[PDB]
Amino acid sequence: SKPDLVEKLLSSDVLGKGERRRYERQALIREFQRHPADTGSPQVMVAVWTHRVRELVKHFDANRKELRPMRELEIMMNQRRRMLTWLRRADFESYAYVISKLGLQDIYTXXXXXXXXXXXXXXXXXXXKTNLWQRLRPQLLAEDPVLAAQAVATAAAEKQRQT
Amino acid sequence: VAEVLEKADYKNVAFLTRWFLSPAGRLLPRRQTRLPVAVHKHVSRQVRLARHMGLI
Amino acid sequence: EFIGRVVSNRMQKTVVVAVSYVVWVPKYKVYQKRVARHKARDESQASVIGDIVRIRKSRKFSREVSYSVVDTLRKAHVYDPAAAAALVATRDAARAAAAASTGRSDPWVAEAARRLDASAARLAALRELYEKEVGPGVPLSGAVLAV
Amino acid sequence: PLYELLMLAKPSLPRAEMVALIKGLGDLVYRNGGFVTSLKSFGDQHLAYDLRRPFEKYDRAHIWQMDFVSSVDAIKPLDHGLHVNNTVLRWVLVKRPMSDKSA
Amino acid sequence: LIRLHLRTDLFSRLPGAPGSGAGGPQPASAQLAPAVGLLPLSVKNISKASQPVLMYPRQLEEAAARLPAGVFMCYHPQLGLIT
Amino acid sequence: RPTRRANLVAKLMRDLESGHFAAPKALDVLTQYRTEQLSYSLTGIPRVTLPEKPLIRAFLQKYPEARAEPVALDSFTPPLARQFAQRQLQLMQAGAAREQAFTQAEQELAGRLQALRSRLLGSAATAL
RNA sequence: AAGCUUCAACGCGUAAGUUUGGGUAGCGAACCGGAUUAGAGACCCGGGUAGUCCAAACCGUCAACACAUUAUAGUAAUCUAUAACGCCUGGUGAUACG
Secondary structure, rough: HHHHHHHHHOOOOOOOOHHHHHHHHHHHHHHOOOOOOOOOOOHHHHHHEEEEEHHHHHHHOOOOOOOOHHHHHHHHHHHHHHHHHHHHHHOOHHHHHHHHOOOOOOOOOOOOOOOOOOOOOOOOOOOOOOHHHHHHHHHHHHHHHHHHHHHHHHHHHHHHHOE | OOOOOOOOOOOOOHHHHHHHHEEOOOOOOOOOOOHHHHHHHHHHHHHHHOOHHHHH | OEEEEEEEEEOOOOOEEEEEEEEEOOOOOOEEEEEEEEEOOOHHHHHHOOOOOEEOOOOOOOOEEEEEEEEEOOOOOOOOOOHHHHHHHHHHHHHHHHHHHHHHOOOHHHHHHHHHHHHHHHHHHHHHHHHHHHOOOOOOOOHHHOO | EEEOOOOEEEOOOOOOOHHHHHHHHHHHOOOOOOOOOOOOOOOOOOOOOOOOOOOOOOOEEEEEEOOOEEOHHHHHHHHHOOOOOOOOOOOOEEEOOOOOOOO | OOOOOOEOOOOOOOOOOOOOOOOOOOOOOOOOOOOOOOOOOOOOOOOOOOOOOOOHHHHHHHHOOOOOOOOOOOOOOOEEOOO | OOOOOOOOHHHHHHHHHHOOOOOOHHHHHHHHHHOOOOOHHHHHHHOOOOOOHHHHHHHHHOOHHHOOOOOOOOOOOOHHHHHHHHHHHHHHHHOOOOOHHHHHHHHHHHHHHHHHHHHHHHHHHHOO
């Protein structure tokens, strides 16, 4: 009985979800690496940042009036953009490998965003005073298809839960 | 004087009435303890919890 | 002859090419870099965006298409999603297979040993390349040994 | 995360129901996969200041401590457990580290 | 970091050998002992990371009299870091 | 508002070369023997920290009579606390840890400690 | 090297002010009352409404100052080489248009 109490202590059930998400964060570092314990290759970086922006975007439809680490949310999004746009130039097979495993589009840069020879399907958006989350939400929805899927899923969920 | 265990987190009356609490329901400030100032601030926090507590 | 990056291929039998040409200004003794855009004929549409191409003057084909594509030097590698999933399969197969064959020797020890001996085999190889190129000599300079 | 609760209790009731009140809080933390480490009271201490602006209960109040390991989901039921009962006045719930360095 | 031992006076102090320097502490005759501060005086970066300047060598002579006494540091691909 | 600079031999030199007048008489002194003017700046505050501080802090915490030797400052013979700390340190670099060295230093230098406490009790009976 | 800067764009933004909802310990514009003085509209004594309080939005300007741009390289700079910047060009005249 007392060993059962010890294993229910040492479980991840009891922890605060800061520590729970940190333990599954080194689970993800065990997943995405090229290697036994590589923690600084750029695939590790973008895996951490993509997962991080997913639990923070859940937290940030939950809390809207937060303002201090929303700067940090921008810092993750911009440094992730820097990391993909570097890694495409640097090691392309790792680039394609990661944004297939995570399932992300291409975000590289009177210009074209490196489309093919033929079949030049395109996606460009240019305008012809906002608050924060009313603009930071649809960008982060826009580049990432998993977040768009979560958006349409929770939209259908609320529309059939109110009905 | 700076024995950490039983003084660092502990809100009970004895240590604070000995060396941390002014007599008129008030506290002993930084100059009257001669203790490391961050540790003093955290135990001053503990004492000032204990002035919100049912004790003191 | 220009060697400059493509930027547009949305365009029939014609690619828009940008070249970094540097103009002098006399006032400040500073070379200012501008980039001009040219329209150039290609024939095979093998130019994906990001390719480094060689354009040359030929007979004009239009009002503003004036060069012709000679050769694409460095190919721009492109995102194929199914091939990317194939690299996912091969890459985690390689990682799991290496960890299973390895897994006391914690796997870092075995891989770092393999990287040490791989670097040693490399250093022996380029050292013997230097040995066949030069002979027994101090690595002072190759400019000294060019005599 | 183990949670101390140096909470107050009504001063001189017959103990037939304050023990039942702790049975209720023990039932509340009994749920959600966690349990009390030690239930250490301090008997009774007369207080330092009066409380209950409505009904004027007074000092001489009773003291209890729970020391329970709980996942964070159980706190909102514990908030109801400490909020609905008018036999208790104040409750202080503190996190404690995994070295089990409790009060 | 790379610690330059600056030449304070009008002699190098080879018997000092201020850290690294010329091997062997023997000049022939000992010299004056001047108290001058540090002889690289008012060094001017005349190339400049925005504007590189080629000075075709007669222009280099005619701008050498524009500035006070001292030696240009120059680059050339066949010769490296030159005067 | 000018600036302090080189001194006296660059200041004599550009006069003395031309045959202005004869020198101040110590020119042979000024030339044959190397100087240094205080070329005054801060290359870095060299606060080179003593290794004997933790050993002397512990020994002065444990035996405070080691604050009370008479000691000749101007002869470089070491005092008793220094042989304490040097004995502990030479047992440290011998390979043992700190506390076993402190115990061996307690055994191997206590004799002068009871000699000193006898001397201090004699001075105590002298003063009172 | 994925670094530096930010033209452009875009957010943060003390406090006032406005729209919406109410009601409100203390704080303190109006409105009436009295005072140094000849008139007194102010300082000061005297009650005290919006607003200060809350929740949502708009505004975004200022001795918002290290008046010390940002960053790197040197031992917390106003010792100063550079990288991208932003701003000034005698004073009075910046308000009016768009």
